[PDB]
C-alpha cells in the first residue's frame, strides 16, 4: 500500500483545515531531535524525552512552526524519575528560536532552565516556563515578549523544586507587556504582589506564595481582571499533606477593605487557605459580577453564622466555605446565617468540613427560596443525625451530598487538601436527583427512613454498614429510583425479594458485598433479579461468590452483567453441572464480565449455557491455560471476546470456523508462541486484533492473509519476541508498508534476534541481504 514506510518515531497527523501538520514525539525515549521531521510541520511536541540541548540546527528547516512543546526533557530532581534522573539542565544555544518567524506557543516547562530564554520571536503569544529554576524576573529580560499574551512562570521556587531564596520581581517588570492577559506566578515563594501590572490582565494567579499583605493599590489598574487567585498565602496548615508554613502570629492574609474596588469585571475570586477569620462586606462593594467565590480552608466557622458580605453577591453562582471548622470543636449543629437567602443566583454551595453532630431541617431554611440551587455539599462533616426527609424541600437540586459522615438511622478525592489542584504534570448524576449517602454509618434501613423522597432518581449507599436481609420493604417510598449504589455493604440475599420495591430500577450495584458470601452454609438467592423488570445493568463484582441457592438468574430486561472477582471456578467445578445455566435465562443479556473468576479452564457446557444475545464477553484475568475455540460456535452473536491476561499458548487453527460474528479479539498478555498456519483465513468479519505481550517469533502470510489484515481498524503486536531472519521478510515488509494502525512501532515492536538486529525496531529493519 504505502510507497515510503514512515520511520520517524513520532505520530504525524494532518488537519488540513487548521493548516496544521502535527508531529507528536511524546515519550519516545529520544536523545536527539529525530531527523526527517516534515518541513511543513506546524505543531512539534517533544515532551518527556532526554534531548540535552536546543540549537540553530534543532528547528532550522521547520520555519512554519507555530507551536513548540518541549516540556520535561530535564524535570527537577524531586518531580522527576529517580531511576532516570536528568544529569544536566537543558542547554539552549543562542539563535535557536529567532528564525521561527511564525512561532506562537513555546512550552519549555520542567527543563531546569536558569533564565528566561532570550531571542524569542515577536509572534510569540504564549510562553510557559513552569518547574524551572528561574526565580528572579528582570524587566530587561521581558522586553522580547512585547506581544506575549499568556506567561506561565510558576512552580520555580517551592518545596518540590526549591530555590532557597525569596522570589524577586523588579518594579514594573510586566507593565510594558501591553497585551499580557494571563500571568501565573504560583508556587514561587513570592513575597509581594508585583506592581505595576498591565491593565490588560484578565487572569492573575498568585497562589501558594509568601504574600503576607495586599497593599490597597496592588490591583488598582486591573479593570479587565476576570480571575484572581490569592489562595495559599498564609495557609491554614492543619492536616496539610505538604510542608506548610503559616504566617506568624496566626495572621490572615491582610487585605485592605478597598483592595478590590477596581476589579469591576472580576468573575472568580479564590481565597482558599488564607487563614481568614472575617470577610468584610466592603471587599465586595464594587464587585457585582462575581460568580465564583472560594473561601475554603480558612477560619470562618463563626463568620458563616453572620456573613453580611453575602448581601453583596446576588450574581454568585458557586460558593465554597469548606473546611472552616474550629480546631478541637465538635459543634452541635450548623448555624447558617439568613444572609444566605440573598444568594438568589447560587447554584452550587459547598460547606464540607464545618464539623457538627446533628443536621436539622430548619438549619437549612436560608436556602429554601434559592431557586437555582443545584448542588448542596455537606460532605465530611461527621454528622451523626439527619432526618433525610428534610430534603423533600429540595426537589429542584441535582445533587445532595452527605458523603463521608457518621449518619446512622465530581471532585477528585484529594481535592481540598492537595497543594496545587491545577498542577500540570509531564457516576449517577445524569439520572436526575441524587442523594449521596456514601461512606456513612447506616447499619439498618427501613421504608420510613426515605419518607417524602419519592422524587429521587439516584441513591448512593456505598460504603455503609448495611447487613440486613432485604425483603422488598426497605425502599418503599423510592418509586422513581433509577440507580441504586449498594456497593461496599454486607448484603444478605436470604430473600429473592430483595430490591423488588424499586420498580423503576435500571442500575443496581451490589459489588464488594462479599461478607456473607465468604462463609459456608448460608443461603444466597441469586435469582432476586426476576422481580426487577426494568433492570438494565447489574454489578456484583468482588463478591467472592462460590455458592448459590438458586441454579439460575433470570431477567427479561438486563443487558449488562458484571460478575468479576467471584468464584465461578468452584460453582462450575468439573463434574457439577448444576450451575452451567446460571446466566442462560438473562434473555436480553448483551455484556457479561466474568474476568477474575479463577477459571483455569471452562467446563464444557459453559458456552451452551450462555444466553442467546451475548455480544461482549470478558474472560480476562482467569489463569486460563486452555480454551476449546470451537465452542465459540454457540455464541452466535459474539462480537467482543476479551481473553487478556491468561495463560493461553495457541490460537485456533481456523478462526472463521469458530465464530462468524467475532469482530474484536483481545489476546494480549498470554503465552502464545506461534500462530496457526491458516489462523485468520477467511475471517472477514474481524476488525480488531490484539496479540501484544505474547511470545510470538514468526508471522507468515498464510496465518495473516492480507485480505483480512487490511480491514482491521487496529492490530496490536507490540512486546513480542520477533525473530528478524529472512523468514520474517514478508512480515517486516508488510508492517513497514501497511496503513493498518499498529501502535508503538517506534517504542516496542522490535527484533529480539538474531544477534545483529537484536533490540532493533522492525519498522527500521533493512533486510536487503535476503534478496542478494
Ligand X SMILES: *[C@@H]1O[C@H](CO)[C@@H](O[C@@H]2O[C@H](CO)[C@@H](O)[C@H](O)[C@H]2NC(C)=O)[C@H](O)[C@H]1NC(C)=O
Ligand Y SMILES: *[C@@H]1O[C@H](CO)[C@@H](O)[C@H](O)[C@H]1NC(C)=O
Task: Choose which of 100, 355, 508, 526 interacts with ligand 9JR (CB under 6 A).
Answer: 355
Please choose, from the candidates 350, 332, 171, 327, the residue with its C-alpha nearest in 3D space to the C-alpha of residue 238.
327
Is residue 551 close enough to count as binding a copy of itself by CB under 8 A?
no
Size of the site for ligand X (CB under 6 A): 9
User: In the beta sheet, which residues pair with residue 507?
Assistant: 483, 537
> What 3-state DSSP class applies to 218?
coil
Stretch that binds ligand X, among 117-125, 151-159, 359-367, 554-562 (CB under 6 A): 151-159
Q: Which residues are annotated as a binding site for guanosine?
A: 382, 406, 492, 523
d(CA 323, CA 301): 9
Q: Which three cell numbers stand for residue 22?
A: 502535527
Task: Choose which of 55, 166, 224, 598 interacts with ligand X (CB under 6 A).
Answer: 166
Stretch that binds ligand Y, among 192-200, 269-277, 387-395, 566-574 (CB under 6 A): 387-395
Binding partner of residue 578 among ligand Y, ligand 9JR, a copy of itself, none, CB under 5 to 8 Å per kind? a copy of itself
Please choose, from the candidates 272, 226, 564, the residue with its C-alpha nearest in 3D space to the C-alpha of residue 416.
272
Nearer to ligand Y, 376 or 525 (CB): 525
Stretch that binds ligand 9JR, among 53-61, 264-272, 427-435, 517-525 (CB under 6 A): 517-525
> What 3-state DSSP class applies to 431?
helix
Is residue 66 close enough to count as binding ligand Y by CB under 6 A?
yes
Nearer to a copy of itself, 353 or 477 (CB): 353
Task: Choose which of 79, 126, 150, 740 interacts with a copy of itself (CB under 8 A).
Answer: 79
Is residue 429 close enough to count as binding ligand 9JR by CB under 6 A?
no
Task: Choose which of 460, 511, 670, 703 interacts with ligand Y (CB under 6 A).
Answer: 460
Is residue 338 close enough to count as binding ligand Y by CB under 6 A?
no
d(CA 459, CA 481): 7
> What 3-state DSSP class applies to 584?
coil
For residue 185, the minimal CB distance to ligand Y (Å) is 22
Count the Cβ atoms, other than its own, within 10 Å of residue 414.
10
Task: Choose which of 41, 42, 189, 297 interacts with ligand X (CB under 6 A).
Answer: 189
Is residue 417 close enough to count as binding a copy of itself by CB under 8 A?
yes
DSSP 84-110: S---S--EE-TTTTTT-TT--EEE-TT
Q: Which residues are annotated as a binding site for Ca(2+)?
A: 766
Size of the site for ligand Y (CB under 6 A): 44
Residue for cell digits 510569540? Answer: 124
Binding partner of residue 166 among ligand Y, a copy of itself, ligand X, none, CB under 5 to 8 Å per kind? ligand X
Q: Which three cell numbers stand for residue 603?
A: 467446563
d(CA 727, CA 711): 25
Is residue 162 close enough to count as binding ligand X by CB under 6 A?
yes
Footprint of ligand Y on residues 462-521 (CB under 6 A)? 462-463, 471, 473, 483, 485, 496
Per-position x/- string for 492-511, each x denoting binding to ligand 9JR as judged by CB under 6 A, each - no binding? x-x-----------------
Is residue 674 close enough to count as binding a copy of itself by CB under 8 A?
no
Task: Choose which of 254, 345, 577, 640 interacts with ligand Y (CB under 6 A).
Answer: 640
Work out whether strand 434-436 and strand 385-386 pair parallel, antiparallel, or are unpaired: unpaired
User: In the beta sheet, which residues pair with residue 665?
Assistant: 641, 689
Burial class (CB in 10 A: 0-12, 13-18, 19+), 174: buried
d(CA 651, CA 653): 7
Q: Which three cell numbers stand for residue 470?
A: 432485604
Instruction: Compute CA distances 10 → 6, 25, 30, whole Å.
Output: 9, 4, 10
Number of H helices, E strands in the chain: 5, 38
Residue for cell digits 505520530? Answer: 11
> What 3-state DSSP class applies to 311?
helix
Stretch that binds ligand 9JR, among 139-147, 173-181, 324-332, 585-593 (CB under 6 A): 324-332
Is residue 266 close enough to count as binding ligand X by CB under 6 A?
no
Binding partner of residue 172 among a copy of itself, ligand Y, ligand 9JR, none, CB under 5 to 8 Å per kind? none
User: In the beta sheet, which residues pair with residue 331?
Assistant: 356
Binding partner of residue 215 among ligand 9JR, ligand X, a copy of itself, none, CB under 5 to 8 Å per kind? none
Contact 225, 266 (CB under 8 A): yes
Contacts of 39-47 with CB under 8 Å at 24 or more apart are 39/63, 39/64, 40/64, 41/65, 42/18, 42/66, 42/67, 43/67, 43/69, 44/68, 44/69, 45/69, 46/70, 46/73, 47/71, 47/72, 47/73, 47/107, 47/426
Contact 150, 125 (CB under 8 A): yes
Work out whether strand 67-69 and strand 434-436 pair parallel, antiparallel, or are unpaired: unpaired
Residue for cell digits 429554601? Answer: 368
Residue nearest to ligand Y (CB): 305
Contact 359, 406 (CB under 8 A): no
Nearer to ligand Y, 91 or 661 (CB): 661
Binding partner of residue 428 among a copy of itself, ligand 9JR, ligand Y, none, CB under 5 to 8 Å per kind? ligand Y
For residue 231, the minimal CB distance to ligand X (Å) is 17
Q: Which residues are annotated as a binding site?
A: 382, 406, 492, 523, 766
Binding partner of residue 431 among ligand 9JR, ligand Y, a copy of itself, none, CB under 5 to 8 Å per kind? none
Per-position x/- string for 367-396, each x denoting binding to ligand 9JR as judged by CB under 6 A, each - no binding? -------------x-x--------------
Binding partner of residue 550 among a copy of itself, ligand X, ligand Y, none, CB under 5 to 8 Å per kind? ligand Y
For residue 542, the minimal CB distance to ligand X (Å) is 35
Is residue 163 close enough to count as binding ligand X by CB under 6 A?
yes
Work out whether strand 20-24 and strand 11-15 pair parallel, antiparallel, or are unpaired: antiparallel
Question: Which stretch of DSSP H or E encloses residue 182?
Answer: strand 182-184
Task: Choose which of 58, 73, 550, 669 interacts with ligand Y (CB under 6 A).
Answer: 550
d(CA 659, CA 460): 41
Contact 437, 407 (CB under 8 A): yes
Q: What are phi and psi of 60, to 5 degrees?
A: -40, -70
Is residue 657 close enough to count as binding ligand Y by CB under 6 A?
yes
Residues that bind ligand Y (CB under 6 A): 20, 22, 43, 66-67, 104-105, 302, 305-306, 335, 387, 389, 392, 403, 427-428, 438-439, 451-452, 460, 462-463, 471, 473, 483, 485, 496, 525, 527, 530-531, 549-551, 591, 593, 616, 618, 633, 640, 657, 664
Residues that bind ligand 9JR (CB under 6 A): 325, 328, 330, 353, 355, 380, 382, 406, 469, 492, 494, 516, 521-523
Amino acid at each position: 500500500a504505502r510507497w515510503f514506510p514512515k520511520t520517524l518515531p513520532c505520530d504525524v497527523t494532518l488537519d488540513v483545515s487548521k493548516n496544521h501538520v502535527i508531529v507528536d514525539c511524546t515519550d519516545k525515549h529520544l536523545t536527539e531531535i529525530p531527523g526527517g521531521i516534515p518541513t511543513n510541520t506546524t505543531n512539534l511536541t517533544l515532551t518527556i524525552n532526554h534531548i540535552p540541548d536546543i540549537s540553530p540546527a534543532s528547528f532550522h528547516r521547520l520555519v512554519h512552526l507555530v507551536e513548540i512543546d518541549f516540556r520535561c526533557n530535564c524535570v527537577p530532581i524531586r518531580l522527576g524519575s529517580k531511576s532516570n534522573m536528568c544529569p544536566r539542565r537543558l542547554q539552549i544555544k543562542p539563535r535557536s528560536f529567532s528564525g521561527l518567524t511564525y512561532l506562537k506557543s513555546l512550552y519549555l516547562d520542567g527543563n531546569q532552565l536558569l533564565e528566561i530564554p532570550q531571542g524569542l520571536p515577536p509572534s510569540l503569544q504564549l510562553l510557559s516556563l513552569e518547574a524551572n529554576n528561574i526565580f528572579s524576573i528582570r524587566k530587561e529580560q521581558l522586553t522580547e515578549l512585547a506581544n506575549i499574551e499568556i506567561l506561565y512562570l510558576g512552580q520555580n521556587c517551592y518545596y518540590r523544586n526549591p530555590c532557597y531564596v525569596s522570589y524577586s520581581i523588579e518594579k514594573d517588570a510586566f507593565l510594558n507587556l501591553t497585551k499580557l492577559k494571563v500571568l501565573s506566578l504560583k508556587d514561587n515563594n513570592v513575597t509581594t504582589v508585583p506592581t505595576v501590572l498591565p491593565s490588560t490582565l484578565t487572569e492573575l494567579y498568585l497562589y501558594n506564595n509568601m504574600i503576607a499583605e495586599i497593599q490597597e493599590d496592588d490591583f488598582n489598574n486591573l479593570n479587565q481582571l476576570q480571575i484572581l487567585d490569592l489562595s495559599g498565602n498564609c495557609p491554614r496548615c492543619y492536616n496539610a499533606p505538604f510542608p506548610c508554613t503559616p504566617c506568624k502570629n496566626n495572621s490572615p492574609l491582610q487585605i485592605p477593605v478597598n483592595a478590590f474596588d477596581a476589579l469591576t469585571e472580576l468573575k472568580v475570586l479564590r481565597l482558599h487557605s488564607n487563614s481568614l477569620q472575617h470577610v468584610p462586606p466592603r471587599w465586595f462593594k464594587n464587585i457585582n459580577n462575581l460568580q465564583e467565590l472560594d473561601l475554603s480552608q480558612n477560619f470562618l466557622a463563626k463568620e458563616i453564622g453572620d456573613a453580611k458580605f453575602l448581601h453583596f453577591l446576588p450574581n454568585l453562582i458557586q460558593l465554597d466555605l469548606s473546611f472552616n471548622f474550629e480546631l478541637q470543636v465538635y459543634r452541635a449543629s450548623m448555624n447558617l446565617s439568613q444572609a444566605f437567602s440573598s444568594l438568589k443566583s447560587l447554584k452550587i454551595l459547598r460547606i464540607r468540613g464545618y464539623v457538627f453532630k446533628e443536621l436539622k431541617s430548619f438549619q437549612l431554611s436560608p436556602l429554601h427560596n434559592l431557586q437555582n440551587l443545584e448542588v448542596l455539599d455537606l460532605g465530611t462533616n461527621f454528622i451523626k443525625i439527619a432526618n433525610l426527609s428534610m430534603f423533600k424541600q429540595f426537589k429542584r437540586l441535582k445533587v445532595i451530598d452527605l458523603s463521608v459522615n457518621k449518619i446512622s438511622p465530581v471532585l477528585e478525592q484529594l481535592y481540598y487538601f492537595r497543594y496545587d489542584k491545577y498542577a500540570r504534570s509531564c457516576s449517577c448524576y445524569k439520572y436526575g436527583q441524587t442523594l449521596d449517602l456514601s461512606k456513612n454509618s447506616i447499619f439498618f434501613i427501613k421504608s420510613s427512613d426515605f419518607q417524602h423522597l419519592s422524587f429521587l432518581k439516584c441513591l448512593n449507599l456505598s460504603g455503609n454498614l448495611i447487613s440486613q436481609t432485604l425483603n422488598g420493604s426497605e425502599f418503599q417510598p423510592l418509586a422513581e429510583l433509577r440507580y441504586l449504589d449498594f456497593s461496599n455493604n454486607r448484603l444478605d440475599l436470604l430473600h429473592s425479594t430483595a430490591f423488588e420495591e424499586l420498580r423503576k430500577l435500571e442500575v443496581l450495584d451490589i459489588s464488594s458485598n462479599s461478607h456473607y458470601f465468604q462463609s459456608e452454609g448460608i443461603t444466597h438467592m441469586l435469582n432476586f433479579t426476576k422481580n426487577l423488570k426494568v433492570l438494565q445493568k447489574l454489578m456484583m463484582n468482588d463478591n467472592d461468590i462460590s455458592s448459590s441457592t438458586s441454579r439460575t438468574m433470570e431477567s427479561e430486561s438486563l443487558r449488562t452483567l458484571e460478575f468479576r472477582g467471584n468464584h465461578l471456578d468452584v460453582l462450575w467445578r468439573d463434574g457439577d453441572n448444576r450451575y452451567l445455566q446460571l446466566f442462560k435465562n438473562l434473555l436480553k443479556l448483551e455484556e457479561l464480565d466474568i474476568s477474575k473468576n479463577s477459571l483455569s479452564f471452562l467446563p464444557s457446557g459453559v458456552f451452551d449455557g450462555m444466553p442467546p444475545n451475548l455480544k461482549n464477553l470478558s474472560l480476562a484475568k482467569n489463569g486460563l491455560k486452555s480454551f476449546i475455540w470451537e465452542k465459540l460456535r454457540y455464541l452466535k452473536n459474539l462480537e467482543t471476546l476479551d481473553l487478556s491476561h491468561n495463560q493461553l499458548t495457541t490460537v485456533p487453527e481456523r478462526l472463521s470456523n469458530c465464530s462468524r460474528s467475532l469482530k474484536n479479539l483481545i489476546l494480549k498478555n498470554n503465552q502464545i508462541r506461534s500462530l496457526t498456519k491458516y489462523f485468520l483465513q477467511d475471517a472477514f468479519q474481524l476488525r480488531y486484533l490484539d496479540l501484544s505481550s505474547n511470545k510470538i517469533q514468526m508471522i507468515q502470510k498464510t496465518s495473516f492473509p492480507e485480505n483480512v489484515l487490511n480491514n482491521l481498524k487496529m492490530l496490536l503486536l507490540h512486546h513480542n519476541r520477533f525473530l528478524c531472519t529472512c523468514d520474517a521478510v514478508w512480515f517486516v515488509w508488510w508492517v513497514q508498508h501497511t496503513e493498518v494502525t499498529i501502535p508503538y512501532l517506534a517504542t516496542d515492536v522490535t527484533c529480539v534476534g538474531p544477534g545483529a538486529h537484536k533490540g532493533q525496531s522492525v519498522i527500521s529493519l533493512d533486510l536487503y541481504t535476503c534478496e542478494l
